[PDB]
């Protein structure tokens, strides 16, 4: 089973500058919940951005989708390509923008997160990817963050 | 991936006479989707409670728990424990009552809708397994199903 899973802003912008706009800490119990144990995929955008410190992160199995053949992710595998990336029952595509492109068309679950942030579409944003009709969702109640900030989770599925 | 997929009652009836009190094709179409392309596991009184007609579900691998050795279920597989049925990627348990019971401890995700039908629970009553502690829970809004009764999602995980 291949799923992704992110959390963008209503306006589908994921991230910005290299980091996230924004701090919704409930979403991050989500992302830990629904990847723990399981392997995750990232792009090596998105790995170098995070600090060393949170790297890799616990109890998965990280792999780091690189177009680098020796490139090292210390704590990581490293593939050149996406089906490399792709056995055990489970793995979790995480992000970034480009990885959730090329991921989509072998996926079968979306997890998403919408934050109620008005946070406009810049150029150069990372942007979630866009869900046609196969993929049939459940809205979640719109909860409400100790950030102060609301959201809403959104499980995906098809075939 | 082991996942439970269940209706209830508000008072966590499942199954009442060796039938379903209640009828909502919303729930049908959830059950479909969800269970789609996957391993489906039912206790033999569930096989029984399927018309011929209906069984096997089609594009789902039916497996059916019985602890008779000859007992015959056409169009699925007989198996006397659940962990022979744990080969695919994805394995979701349809009933009944003592099959959730059973398959709790291996499940990582509940899928639970939730009938806002005012039913006591009567002696011989199939009774939804109660969740505790470990489980992480996402719920949806209450909707108007065609029948006339409300209904609710749930989504549960534990890593
Ligand atoms: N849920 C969220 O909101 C999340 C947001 N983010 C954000 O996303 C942004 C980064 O996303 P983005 O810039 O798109 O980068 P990605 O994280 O998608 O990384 C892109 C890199 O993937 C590598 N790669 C290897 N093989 C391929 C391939 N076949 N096709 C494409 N890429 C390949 C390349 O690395 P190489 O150059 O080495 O070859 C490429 O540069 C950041 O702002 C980050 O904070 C990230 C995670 C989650
Ligand atoms: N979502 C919902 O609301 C659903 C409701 N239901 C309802 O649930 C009811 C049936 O549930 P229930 O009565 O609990 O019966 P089950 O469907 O759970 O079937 C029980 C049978 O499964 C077999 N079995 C049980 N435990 C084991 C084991 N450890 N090893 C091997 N075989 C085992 C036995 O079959 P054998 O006797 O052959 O050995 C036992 O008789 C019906 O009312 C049905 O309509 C059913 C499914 C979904
Ligand atoms: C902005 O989102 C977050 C902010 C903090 C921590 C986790 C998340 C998150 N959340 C969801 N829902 N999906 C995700 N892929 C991620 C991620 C990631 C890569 C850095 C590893
Ligand atoms: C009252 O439930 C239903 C009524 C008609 C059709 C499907 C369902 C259903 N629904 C959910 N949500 N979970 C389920 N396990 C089932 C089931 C089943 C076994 C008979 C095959
Ligand atoms: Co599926
Ligand atoms: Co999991």
Same mark, same amino acid.
């Given at each position: 089973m291949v799923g992704l899973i992110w959390?963008? &802003? %209503? *306006?589908?912008?994921?991230?910005?500058?290299? +980091? !996230? $706009?924004?701090?919704? =800490?409930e979403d991050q119990a989500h992302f830990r919940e629904i990847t723990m144990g399981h392997t995750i995929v990232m @792009? /090596?955008?998105?790995? +170098? *951005?995070? =600090? &060393?410190?949170v790297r890799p992160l616990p109890g998965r199995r990280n792999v780091v989708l690189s177009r680098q053949a020796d490139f090292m992710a210390s704590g990581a595998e490293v593939v050149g390509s996406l089906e490399e990336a792709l056995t055990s029952p489970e793995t979790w595509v995480i992000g970034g923008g480009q990885v959730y492109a090329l991921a989509l068309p072998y996926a079968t /679950?979306?997890?998403?997160?919408?934050?109620? !942030?008005?946070? =406009?579409?810049? &150029? @150069? +944003?990372?942007? &979630? $990817?866009?869900? +046609?009709? %196969?993929?049939?969702?459940?809205?979640?109640?719109?909860?409400? *963050?100790? *950030?102060?900030?609301?959201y809403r989770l959104y499980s995906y599925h098809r075939s």
């Amino acid at each position: 089973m291949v799923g992704l899973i992110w959390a963008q &802003a %209503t *306006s589908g912008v994921i991230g910005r500058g290299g +980091d !996230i $706009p924004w701090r919704l =800490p409930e979403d991050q119990a989500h992302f830990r919940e629904i990847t723990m144990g399981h392997t995750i995929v990232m @792009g /090596r955008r998105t790995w +170098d *951005s995070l =600090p &060393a410190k949170v790297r890799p992160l616990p109890g998965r199995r990280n792999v780091v989708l690189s177009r680098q053949a020796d490139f090292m992710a210390s704590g990581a595998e490293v593939v050149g390509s996406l089906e490399e990336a792709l056995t055990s029952p489970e793995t979790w595509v995480i992000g970034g923008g480009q990885v959730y492109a090329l991921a989509l068309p072998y996926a079968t /679950r979306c997890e998403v997160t919408e934050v109620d !942030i008005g946070l =406009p579409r810049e &150029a @150069g +944003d990372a942007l &979630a $990817p866009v869900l +046609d009709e %196969t993929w049939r969702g459940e809205t979640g109640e719109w909860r409400f *963050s100790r *950030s102060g900030l609301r959201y809403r989770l959104y499980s995906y599925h098809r075939s």
